[PDB]
Amino acid sequence: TKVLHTDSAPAAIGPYIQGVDLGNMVLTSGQIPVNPATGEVPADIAAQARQSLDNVKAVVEASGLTVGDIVKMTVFVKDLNDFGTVNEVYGNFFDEHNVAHYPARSCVEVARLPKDVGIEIEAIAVR
Amino acid sequence: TKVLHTDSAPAAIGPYIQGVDLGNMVLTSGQIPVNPATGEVPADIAAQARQSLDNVKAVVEASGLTVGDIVKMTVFVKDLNDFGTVNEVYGNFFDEHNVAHYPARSCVEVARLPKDVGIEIEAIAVR
Amino acid sequence: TKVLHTDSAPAAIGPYIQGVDLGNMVLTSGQIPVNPATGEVPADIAAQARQSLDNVKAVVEASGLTVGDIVKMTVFVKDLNDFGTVNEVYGNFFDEHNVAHYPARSCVEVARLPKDVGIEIEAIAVR
Ligand SMILES: [Ca+2]
Ligand SMILES: [Ca+2]
Ligand SMILES: [Mg+2]
Numbered sequence A, B, C: 001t002k003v004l005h006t007d008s009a010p011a012a013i014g015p016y017i018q019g020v021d022l023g024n025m026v027l028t029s030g031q032i033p034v035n036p037a038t039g040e041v042p043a044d045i046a047a048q049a050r051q052s053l054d055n056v057k058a059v060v061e062a063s064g065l066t067v068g069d070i071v072k073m074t075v076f077v078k079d080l081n082d083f084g085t086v087n088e089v090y091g092n093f094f095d096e097h098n099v100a101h102y103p104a105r106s107c108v109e110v111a112r113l114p115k116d117v118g119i120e121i122e123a124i125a126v127r
Helices: A044-064 A079-095 B045-062 B082-097 C044-061 C078-096
Strands: A002-004 A019-021 A025-028 A070-077 A102-110 A119-126 B001-005 B020-022 B025-028 B070-077 B104-109 B117-127 C001-006 C018-021 C025-028 C070-077 C104-108 C120-124
Touching: A025 A044, A044 A070, A044 A119, A070 A079, A102 B070, A102 B104, A102 B117, A119 C001, A119 C104, B020 B045, B025 B045, B045 B082, B045 B117, B070 B082, B082 B104, B104 C070, B104 C120, C001 C044, C001 C120, C025 C044, C044 C070, C044 C078, C044 C120, C070 C078, C078 C104
Parallel strands: A070 A102, B070 B104, C070 C104
Antiparallel strands: A002 A019, A019 A025, A025 A119, A070 A119, B001 B020, B020 B025, B025 B117, B070 B117, C001 C018, C018 C025, C025 C120, C070 C120
């Protein structure tokens, strides 16, 4: 087991690590749309969706793996009315990374997220 | 890793795959109560719980595994007040498949689900 | 695979097991803050958080592993306004167990939890 840490994902400010490498599998903590360079969250959902995805990417890359190694993700959103926009950003993100296939996924609307963000994404990648 | 696909589960009409086979473990995407042949969702929760479970079963079976190979399920519901009905159907489904033991499970009521369905279920199975 | 059972975690009263041991990984069912000795749930969120964590620990210990082997946990809460208290208890718990590092984590506010509890936690541990 190895702790994953990267300055390209929001700093772990609390009792948790950004992600963990189990050897054959990598698990990331749920990533909120905080910009790692400023500590701020963009106002619009499209930008938040892309920021969370970029954060997931940073944690996965810290293990030496790539976006294409992601096999499952869970997407928690604050409002499914924005699902069209989130899916568009989400699909485009994987397309832009030239992945062989999209990962398996679960998506649900929650009552609230940390810092009142509109989305949180956790992922599983395999080596 | 291998992509899982079956006509017995709702077609992936978004940026995701039905499930993934990691060799030792199989992970399904969250399955909603859509009838794969008609694209329709039954009106009552008992029927929806049944359809989602059948969908999960289809994805797991696509890997060559069975319902008895499921080790963990996460059940997201729209209403814990229907938990009596959901719990009945859930237990019945596993009993009908003559499993040695029920899987580990987490159940929570979410704020909303894709397509305004009443339940979404994701599963982990092992070979 | 092996079924995990312990009298130190709430009794599985339904179609599920407390946890499962897959050999290299242990998965616990979501643990609610029920005190296994009395069957009661404490009123305050701090007590509930510690009770759920102790229940998770009990399931993990039933496999032969320890708190230090926990690598990922998902924390579902009924109210994020109680998150300062939950993080406090959560960090204190791992600190008291002298873990080398905190595990990866995802935290979201749900609409409702079984028995109307304020927190539910599920964990993954590795051997
Ligand atoms: Ca496009
Ligand atoms: Ca709602
Ligand atoms: Mg109701």
